[PDB]
From a paper:
To provide static characterization of cognate ligand recognition by NK1R and modulation of ligand binding by the residue in position 2.50, we determined the crystal structures of two human NK1R variants, with aspartic acid or asparagine at the 2.50 position, bound to the antagonist aprepitant. The crystal structure of NK1R bound to aprepitant provides a detailed static picture of how the receptor interacts with its antagonist.
To further improve the crystal quality, the residue at the 2.50 position was mutated to asparagine and Q1654.60A was reinstated, whereas Y1213.41W and T2225.64R were maintained. The higher resolution structure was used in the discussion below. In contrast, in the structure with the E782.50N mutant, the side chain of N782.50 rotates by ~30°, eliminating the interaction between N782.50 and N3017.49 (3.5 Å). This conformational change may influence receptor signaling by disrupting interactions required for activation. Similarly, the other single mutations, E782.50N and N3017.49E, caused severe loss of the SP-induced Gs and Gq signaling, while the double mutant E782.50N/N3017.49E restored downstream cAMP and IP accumulation levels (to 50–80%) when compared to the wild-type receptor. For the E782.50N mutant, the two peaks P2a and P2b merged accidentally into a single peak, while the peaks P1a and P1b remained separated.
Numbering used by the authors: 25 to 226, 1001 to 1010, 1017 to 1117, 237 to 321
Write the structure that this text describes.
Amino acid sequence: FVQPAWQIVLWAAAYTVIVVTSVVGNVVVMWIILAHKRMRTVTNYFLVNLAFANASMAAFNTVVNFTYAVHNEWYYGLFYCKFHNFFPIAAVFASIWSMTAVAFDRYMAIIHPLQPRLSATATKVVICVIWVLALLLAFPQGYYSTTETMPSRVVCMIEWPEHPNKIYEKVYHICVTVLIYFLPLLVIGYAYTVVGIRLWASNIFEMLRIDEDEAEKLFNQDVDAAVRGILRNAKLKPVYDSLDAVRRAALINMVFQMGETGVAGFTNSLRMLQQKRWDEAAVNLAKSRWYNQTPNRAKRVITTFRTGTWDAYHEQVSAKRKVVKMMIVVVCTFAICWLPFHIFFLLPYINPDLYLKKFIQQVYLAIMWLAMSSTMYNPIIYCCLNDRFRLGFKHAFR
Ligand SMILES: C[C@@H](O[C@H]1OCCN(Cc2nc(=O)[nH][nH]2)[C@H]1c1ccc(F)cc1)c1cc(C(F)(F)F)cc(C(F)(F)F)c1
């Protein structure tokens, strides 16, 4: 019942913001990658496909979806009725599976470096396939879309053939929802956790192999022997118990080098770590004879005590971590934007009367705004979290 003019203009402005920032932003992103030829990096080829799918959905559907929702009248005829119901499914499938292709490409480059799967022709055939499967999946929704002509208006409504309980319509809707939301997010979710652990995490075995032809060193049995010994030692047990897993590895690393007795000698530094005075302990340990004899190892161990991270046992400058952080954000943005949408359309099966009663028009206009805003965020994310992308946007200015 809430229908004031003060609100409609305020919403129309909120919706145009989407159409402009999505077209402007994604046309520039497509330009940055395609024109440079140095930028054509397989991951960026899928980002072009994602930028096209985004920009297309904003241009074709935003005006048409907003006007129908505001006036409850279909102005654009039977063809555009079929088209506005077909295109969003195809464009969302293409977007989320281009994101999955990027995730699979990173997973392959990071976890399986010896088996290459990146090829310019293959990337083109993947993008080609993604779109074929997207248009096929969207087809039944477009096929059953039609107009109904009435005395005061025209109505665009989707009508499936009459069946005892309309199973095919409900099965189709669930299948689309799984293919464009739940399933690819599970695949991307899997890929970036494994990749995330590889790029950011580490362990004592990884550590000891770096700090310590010839026979292979057996750390497995000695690490457990080193833990059993520290917990038997009165001078080392309170410190060790107080420490997080990362710092515990730094303390064990020291025991592997000097032994239980030699480590127990650093009484002051061990009390600093126990008191959680990291920088103080780091400063005192760099003054030791141990640091003098082996500065490179000691600097790595000290950094582990100072930061409480695996930073010393990973590369300093990595273009790999920059992309993975950027793409994790993009996917999390997608998952957020589409969740209320899918719940809104999933609910007519659980509680059919719950929607129609209240002022769901202001609810739907908020929910549809969120869903459609997923189309404009990606260029913004690229400028904030990537150097070469933000410099590319600056170059497109007169
Ligand atoms: C075309 C439209 O579809 C909805 O509105 C019509 C009925 N339809 C329920 C139904 N009736 C059937 O017969 N099948 N499904 C809805 C629906 C269909 C599939 C879904 F996965 C979710 C909702 C739609 C779909 C998406 C998408 F693709 F992202 F989902 C995004 C957007 C936009 F962002 F532009 F507003 C619009």
